[PDB]
Amino acid sequence: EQESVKEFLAKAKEEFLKKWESPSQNTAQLDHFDRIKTLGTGSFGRVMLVKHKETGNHYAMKILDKQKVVKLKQIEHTLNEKRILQAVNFPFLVKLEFSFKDNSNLYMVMEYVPGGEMFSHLRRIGRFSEPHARFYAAQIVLTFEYLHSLDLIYRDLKPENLLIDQQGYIQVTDFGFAKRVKGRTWTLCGTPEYLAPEIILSKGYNKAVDWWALGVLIYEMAAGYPPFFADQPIQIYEKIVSGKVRFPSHFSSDLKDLLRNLLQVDLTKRFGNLKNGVNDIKNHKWFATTDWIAIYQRKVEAPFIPKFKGPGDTSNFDDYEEEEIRVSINEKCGKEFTEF
Numbered sequence: 001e002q003e004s005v006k007e008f009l010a011k012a013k014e015e016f017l018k019k020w021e022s023p024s025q026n027t028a029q030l031d032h033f034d035r036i037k038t039l040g041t042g043s044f045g046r047v048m049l050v051k052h053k054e055t056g057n058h059y060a061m062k063i064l065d066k067q068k069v070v071k072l073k074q075i076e077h078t079l080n081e082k083r084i085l086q087a088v089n090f091p092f093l094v095k096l097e098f099s100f101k102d103n104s105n106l107y108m109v110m111e112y113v114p115g116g117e118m119f120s121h122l123r124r125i126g127r128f129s130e131p132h133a134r135f136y137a138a139q140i141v142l143t144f145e146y147l148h149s150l151d152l153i154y155r156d157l158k159p160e161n162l163l164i165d166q167q168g169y170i171q172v173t174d175f176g177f178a179k180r181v182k183g184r185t186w187t188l189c190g191t192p193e194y195l196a197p198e199i200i201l202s203k204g205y206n207k208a209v210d211w212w213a214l215g216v217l218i219y220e221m222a223a224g225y226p227p228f229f230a231d232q233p234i235q236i237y238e239k240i241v242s243g244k245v246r247f248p249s250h251f252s253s254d255l256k257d258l259l260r261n262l263l264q265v266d267l268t269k270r271f272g273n274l275k276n277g278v279n280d281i282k283n284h285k286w287f288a289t290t291d292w293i294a295i296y297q298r299k300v301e302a303p304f305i306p307k308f309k310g311p312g313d314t315s316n317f318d319d320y321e322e323e324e325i326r327v328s329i330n331e332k333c334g335k336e337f338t339e340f
C-alpha cells in the first residue's frame with residue numbers, strides 16, 4: 001500500500017478513463033497495408049501479419065467478420081475488446097495501434113510480437129523452471145493489478161494468449177473477453193482448462209476468476225500440463241469444482257502453497273480476492289526473489305530471448321491456409337457496430 005503504488009494506479013485510472021470516455025475510431029484503412037501471412041484463425045476472425053506501405057512497420061492485424069461476430073453472439077465482447085484496448089497502457093499489454101471497419105469486417109491493428117506464443121515455447125521445452133515461470137508470473141501479477149484497478153477483468157488467461165517479445169518479456173494479447181465490471185458479471189466465456197469454479201457453476205463472478213486462472217497458468221508453466229487436465233470438457237469441469245489438485249513432487253513447497261491459495265474453490269478465500277488484495281500474492285514466499293519494480297521497468301534479464309531474424313520473421317508462428325479479405329459491396333451489421 002505504498003503511496004507510490006497508490007499514486008501510480010490513480011494516474012493509470014485517470015488516463016484510462018479519459019480514453020474510455022472518448023474512444024478513438026477510424027484511424028487507418030485496409031489499403032494502407034500489405035498482407036504478409038496468416039498468423040492464426042478462428043470461428044469469426046483471423047490475425048494476419050501486415051506491413052504498412054508508407055512506414056514499413058509490421059503489425060498483427062486482427063480481422064473480425066461482422067456477420068460471424070453477430071451469429072456467435074460476440075457483439076458486446078468485440079465492442080469491449082476495442083474500447084478497452086484503445087484506452088489501456090501498460091508494459092506487458094499489447095498495444096492497439098489503429099482500428100477501423102468497412103462494409104464486412106472490423107480491424108484491430110496490433111503491435112506484432114515476433115517471438116510467438118508462450119504455449120509454443122512451453123511445449124517445445126516441456127516445462128519451465130520455477131525461476132522462469134516466476135518471471136512470467138510476476139508480469140501477469142502486475143498486469144492484473146493494473147487491469148483490476150481500472151475495474152477490468154481479463155477472462156482469457158492461457159499460454160496461447162501470452163506472446164514473447166524481442167526482450168523475452170510477455171505481451172498479453174486477445175482482449176476478446178475483457179470487460180469493464182464493477183461488481184459481478186455472468187457470461188460463460190474463457191477456455192475450459194482455465195475456468196474458475198464459479199464460472200462453471202453459472203454464478204455472478206468477479207476479478208477473482210483472473211487470479212484462479214493465474215494459478216492454472218503457473219501450474220501449467222511449472223509442470224508442463226494444466227492441473228485439471230482431462231480428455232473432455234465435462235471431465236475437466238468435474239475436476240475443477242472438486243476442490244482437489246495433485247502437485248508434481250518436483251514442485252517446491254512454496255509453489256504448492258501459493259497454488260493452493262490461487263486454486264481455492266471458495267472465491268471468498270482465494271488469494272487476490274482477500275482484504276489485502278494483490279499484496280497477498282506479491283508478498284508470498286514464492287515471490288521472495290522478485291524485484292517488482294525492476295520487472296515493471298524491464299531491467300531484469302529474461303529467461304530466454306526468442307530466436308527470430310527481424311520484425312517480419314514469422315518462424316515462431318505456424319502455417320494456416322491463406323484466405324481472402326473480402327469486403328462486401330453492401331454494408332453489413334452497421335447498426336450493431338456503430339461505436340466501433
Ligand SMILES: O=C(O)c1ccc([N+](=O)[O-])cc1
Nearest residue numbers: 047060110111112113173174
Ligand atoms: O491481441 C491479439 O489478439 C493479438 C494476436 C496476435 C498478435 N501477434 O501476433 O503479435 C498480437 C495481438
